[PDB]
Amino acid sequence: TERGLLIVLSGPSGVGKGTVREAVFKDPETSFDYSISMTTRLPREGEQDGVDYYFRSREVFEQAIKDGKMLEYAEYVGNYYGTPLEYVEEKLAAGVDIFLEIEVQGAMQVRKAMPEGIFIFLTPPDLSELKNRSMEVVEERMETAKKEIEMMASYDYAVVNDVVANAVQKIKGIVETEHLKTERVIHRYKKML
Amino acid sequence: RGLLIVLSGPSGVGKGTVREAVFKDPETSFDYSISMTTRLPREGEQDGVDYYFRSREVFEQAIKDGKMLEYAEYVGNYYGTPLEYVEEKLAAGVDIFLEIEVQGAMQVRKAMPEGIFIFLTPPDLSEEERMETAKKEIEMMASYDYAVVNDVVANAVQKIKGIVETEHLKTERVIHRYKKMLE
Ligand code: NA
Numbered sequence A: 001t002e003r004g005l006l007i008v009l010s011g012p013s014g015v016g017k018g019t020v021r022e023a024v025f026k027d028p029e030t031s032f033d034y035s036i037s038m039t040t041r042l043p044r045e046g047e048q049d050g051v052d053y054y055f056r057s058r059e060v061f062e063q064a065i066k067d068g069k070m071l072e073y074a075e076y077v078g079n080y081y082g083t084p085l086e087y088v089e090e091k092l093a094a095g096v097d098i099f100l101e102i103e104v105q106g107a108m109q110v111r112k113a114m115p116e117g118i119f120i121f122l123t124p125p126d127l128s129e130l131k132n133r134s135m136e137v138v139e140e141r142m143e144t145a146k147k148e149i150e151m152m153a154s155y156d157y158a159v160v161n162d163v164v165a166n167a168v169q170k171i172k173g174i175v176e177t178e179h180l181k182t183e184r185v186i187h188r189y190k191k192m193l
Numbered sequence B: 001r002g003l004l005i006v007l008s009g010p011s012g013v014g015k016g017t018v019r020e021a022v023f024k025d026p027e028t029s030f031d032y033s034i035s036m037t038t039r040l041p042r043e044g045e046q047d048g049v050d051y052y053f054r055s056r057e058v059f060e061q062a063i064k065d066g067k068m069l070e071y072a073e074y075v076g077n078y079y080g081t082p083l084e085y086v087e088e089k090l091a092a093g094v095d096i097f098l099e100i101e102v103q104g105a106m107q108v109r110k111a112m113p114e115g116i117f118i119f120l121t122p123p124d125l126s127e128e129e130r131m132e133t134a135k136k137e138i139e140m141m142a143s144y145d146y147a148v149v150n151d152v153v154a155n156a157v158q159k160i161k162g163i164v165e166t167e168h169l170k171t172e173r174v175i176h177r178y179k180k181m182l183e
Helices: A017-026 A058-066 A085-093 A104-113 A136-152 A164-179 A182-192 B015-024 B056-064 B083-091 B102-111 B129-141 B153-168 B171-182
Strands: A006-010 A070-075 A080-084 A098-101 A118-123 A157-160 B004-008 B068-074 B077-082 B096-099 B116-121 B146-149
Touching: A006 A017, A006 A104, A006 A164, A017 A098, A017 A164, A058 A070, A058 A080, A070 A085, A070 A104, A080 A085, A085 A098, A118 A136, A118 A164, A136 B171, A157 A164, A157 B171, A164 B153, A182 B129, A182 B146, B004 B015, B004 B102, B004 B153, B015 B096, B015 B153, B056 B068, B056 B077, B068 B083, B068 B102, B077 B083, B077 B102, B083 B096, B116 B129, B116 B153, B146 B153
Parallel strands: A006 A098, A006 A118, A118 A157, B004 B096, B004 B116, B116 B146
Antiparallel strands: A070 A080, B068 B077
């Protein structure tokens, strides 16, 4: 059993992260597991622990935060929501790739907690077409572009969401390429011997 | 700037077969790195297509003048990669695909680390001399960036295309493109 990879897809709000993540999971060639979040809220109708969420108490959640066992977390209306280190680690050690789609502020928490993850920045198609366009809106668009390029330096790869199908193909290519790195390939061959 | 893609692996692994299939693929944007040789053309071979056919005098002068990226002599015949052709195509934004023997690949690695080194792996490795070969192939592999099994030629081709596209999507390269656009 080769170690799984944590694949983190982020990028600005409205770039199509949700749509790309859905298409990645619909693709018959992918074999990712979705990251299951831990929450302190109680289950709703049809929800199962270990399937929809890891339902835990506030005490358990805060203890996980204090012990550095939380990759990312936030409190949304008195309820904690977060990505637990223990369950991500168990799946990676069992050889399963985990795919996590998250907002840019959440991604920086995950990056600090798990630098071994593969961080993909989903890019607006307008970023390359910026010059093919001073108004306060033009000044804002140029400022947005500069900050996206600066944010991108924290990521491993940047993929343009020109066509959802194209972003999916590039993401599959990234994950396959990461598994072909000789450090990982040698590990497989040595464990065989 | 174009990427230097170096495909290597042991003799008989199918480097030639995989390189031919890579160039037959309609999606390939790679330009084949044509080697220079002092041997005469074989049946169906053309200068500037299959090889740069040159005399020993020209080749030895290119060696002496530091104009070879890598070279070797095999039973009186020189084979090598001219440095200028590579450097010019890379600067013009063309990706270069170089299929070479393991000893040639290590010359290129020393000269140009920025290259993407792909080790084409025998399928029998996962399945006394055979064990010794396997151990040395695993040891060699550590000097390469990626290792691709030649299980099915079509599968090796898609993994190689995937490697080149992924290297193009690295944020260091993507940021460089966007900054130039910015000004
Ligand atoms: Na596809």
